[PDB]
Amino acid sequence: NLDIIGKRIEKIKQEHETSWHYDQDHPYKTWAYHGSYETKQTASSMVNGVVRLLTKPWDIIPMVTQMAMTFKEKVDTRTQEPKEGTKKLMKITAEWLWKELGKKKTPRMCTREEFTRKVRSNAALGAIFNKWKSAREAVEDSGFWELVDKERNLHLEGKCETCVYNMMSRAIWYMWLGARFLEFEALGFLNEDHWFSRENSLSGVEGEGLHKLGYILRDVSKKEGGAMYADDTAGWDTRITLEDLKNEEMVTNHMEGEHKKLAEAIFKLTYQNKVVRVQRPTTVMDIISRRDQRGSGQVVTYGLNTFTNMEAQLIRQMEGEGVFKSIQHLTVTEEIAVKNWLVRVGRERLSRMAISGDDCVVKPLDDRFASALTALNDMGKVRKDIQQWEPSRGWNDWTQVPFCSHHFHELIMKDGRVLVVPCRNQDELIGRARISQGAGWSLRETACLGKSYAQMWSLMYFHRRDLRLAANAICSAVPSHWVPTSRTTATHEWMTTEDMLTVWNRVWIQENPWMEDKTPVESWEEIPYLGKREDQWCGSLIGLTSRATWAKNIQTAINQVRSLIGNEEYTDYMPSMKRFRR
Ligand SMILES: CN(Cc1cccc(F)c1)S(N)(=O)=O
Ligand SMILES: [Zn+2]
Ligand SMILES: [Zn+2]
Structure with missing residues (x-):
């Protein structure tokens, strides 16, 4: 001590x-x-006026407006030491996982x-x-x-x-x-050298990007097995033993x-x-x-969380397949069985998971996994919002599974090619774009942050009618050559002054390993949206009077922001959409 x-x-x-x-x-x-x-002193959140002036309908939606306003009795909790059989399962699994991760990597100093x-x-x-x-x-x-x-x-x-x-x-x-x-x-090498890449770790998605996660969950969906399980842990950092x-x-x-x-x-x-x-x-x-508990730096926290989560989930998979019978004590024939399971099927079982730090999706061999709770509860990885011994709910459709704050839609382009696109409630997307972190920001800095959100929306959320419109409006209201900025930078392909249609083509066609046909897309109208009803289900305001007035008079909102920023060089991006192309 x-x-x-x-x-x-x-x-x-x-x-x-x-x-x-x-x-x-x-x-x-x-x-x-x-x-x-x-000692003495205190850091609150400011509104981005450029994004807010160009999203007026959302000024009356409490889910948006409330996000910009504003349990440490979970840091003062205690987790029991696992039982001996749990500890053996964990040590054996950890030993085997570091070996696998290190087979094609060399640890080194940064x-x-x-x-x-x-x-x-x-x-x-x-x-x-x-x-x-x-x-x-x-x-x-x-x-x-x-x-x-x-x-x-x-x-x-x-x-x-x-x-x-x-x-x-x-x-x-x-x-x-x-x-x-x-x-x-x-x-640093864990992150810098991509130890949790999917190619290297099989379960990991480090470096993957929001345009890849949907295709990954869909690949896991192909695997014969039971439901997809997505249990969140109640305060993961506080339960690290x-x-x-x-x-x-x-x-x-x-x-x-x-x-x-x-x-x-x-x-x-x-x-x-x-x-x-x-x-x-x-x-x-x-x-x-x-x-005990977690308090590394944010980036080492991510890699060690992914590691320990991969470990917990292989063990929960072991419990579901009856590789061991009790966490109380492992026999010697049971250590032999655990080791032989890892050697024989461990890589296959890792490929059935998508793990991002404390977040996971598992498609186990069958639905015994749902009630295999003894090792998971004894390791202290207690599930959020379900009674300790109540079996896990399973998802029957990969397009319903939550992962990294998103769900994923399957979207078929007019030419038959298949996009798997990320999505979350649109109030959440608009509410985050309306917020800046820190203060002392010029009008130009604020405009350049708005432009970052707008470009992210055009690349990841193009299929949401309100976000494609608002993205074109923000990119029309900010000077064409001003560089997008952020203060806490997933792969960030929207952080560029390149043409967004050219980045779309590189990300979704040229560099997308799930697209066999590499024919470029020639305009934004080739690029589809979700169904109208699905767009509303995921929070669209299409069909509302407030939204129809906003869209119809968008050039007046654009001109309001242009007048505030001043006499600069602007582009009209609105004619990239059918309804403004005359
Ligand atoms: C909300 N619908 C009409 C609509 C208005 C504006 C833009 C649209 F893309 C569609 S509806 N009732 O589903 O036909
Ligand atoms: Zn020191
Ligand atoms: Zn959606």
């Missing part, structure tokens, strides 16, 4: 030596508590060079405000990298000074850039030299022991520790 966290604690204690107060009205049972010190280019084009890594302002600055100064070297040589010693979590079912723990770097050095963290760390068994020692230190000193600074209003800072 305190040998490993103490140094980190001693250090923070002294940076606030005229504050430290061992409180006894501290709200922690599950989190160990060490003391407190003085570089300062790599880390630096990352910071300069942004994929929200999670830094702090203070010695430097942004992370952009700290990365150019060689002082920083001496801070990073001091800590690096400490980790090689088996000690930690500065790797401390900052807390704010969404709980996000930011660290100072230097600790993020050391995390990236050691584990010390035993889960030890099975993840076995990736170090695949490493060597310095790398191996660097990865071991991250696992031992920052994941399997943790120090967090939490802001308490009654406003002070509480310095609390615990061994």
Whole structure:
């Protein structure tokens, strides 16, 4: 315990030596508590005026307007240690899964060079405000990298000074850039080298993109078996056990030299022991520790979640096929049976799943899976919104399965080629596009974010009548050459100034491995929509009076936004649609 966290604690204690107060009205049972010190301050969500002015009908839809306004008693919960048979099932499965993932990959260190280019084009890594302002600055100064070297040589010693979590079912723990770097050095390879790609991992979809996920679920649907199962876990990050963290760390068994020692230190000193600074209003800072749960960086969290989820689901599949009889204790003939199952059918059983971090779809061999709940509940992966021992509901149609906040439609083009397109309730799509994160944004920055949403809609949601119209209207109201932007970048093919019809053709035809005929599409009118009734089912306003006035007078809304931005070069995209083409 305190040998490993103490140094980190001693250090923070002294940076606030005229504050430290061992409180006894501290709200922690599950989190160990060490003391407190003085602090003050707080980050809300702003409306994007460009998107809102061009989506007026939605100004009266509460599902949209409410999204822009605004359980930490789930972080203070506790999960029992699995039984011995569960622990054996998990260790055997984890050992076998790292081997399979490593068959065609070489673990390796990520570089300062790599880390630096990352910071300069942004994929929200999670830094702090203070010695430097942004992370952009700290990365150019060689002082920083001496801070990073001091800590690096400490980790090689088996000690930690500065790797401390900052807390704010969404709980996000930011660290100072230097600790993020050391995390990236050691584990970045999982993401950077695509360990959870579908080609490499069979269950994974890392790098896949929203235009590929539907085709993937459909491929899983082809497999002979029972229903498709899509159980969400109640607070996945909060149910990661010390035993889960030890099975993840076995990736170090695949490493060597310095790398191996660097990865071991991250696992031992920052994941399997943790120090967090939490802001308490009654406003002070509480310095609390615990061994279990998830608090890596967002990107390592994703790969380790995918790994442990693949593992849980192969085991749930094992329980459904009667590979083992009780989680209480595995016999020796049962270890032999588990191992031989993995060797004989493990790759086939991985190909029956689509797993994105904590999210999964499984098409098991048959419907025994639905009531195979003992290992899943004993690993602590307790299902959301169903009684502990009530069997899982199954989906009989792959176009009804929820995955990554979406469902997928099968859509036949006038020439017979088949698109599998992503979809979610349209109020959700319009409500997110109306929101900007952070403040201090020019009218040009706001316009360029609107343009990003519009281009995403044209590429992923072209089949929704209201989104194709609104996308053409936003792209008509923002200057033709202004570059789309984002502040927390799935593959993002809409982030470009290329012609959207040209990107559509590349994404949906040329690069789509499910399309045998590569004949390009010549205009947007070749590109189909969902059926009118399906469009309404998924939240369209077609048939409403508000919507008919909006569409008919769209050029007046476009002209309102153009007048606000000013005298710039604009394109009329509205004639790409039949009803505005005269
Ligand atoms: C809502 N329908 C008509 C409609 C109005 C505007 C655009 C459309 F694409 C279709 S309906 N009642 O299903 O025919
Ligand atoms: Zn450290
Ligand atoms: Zn839909």
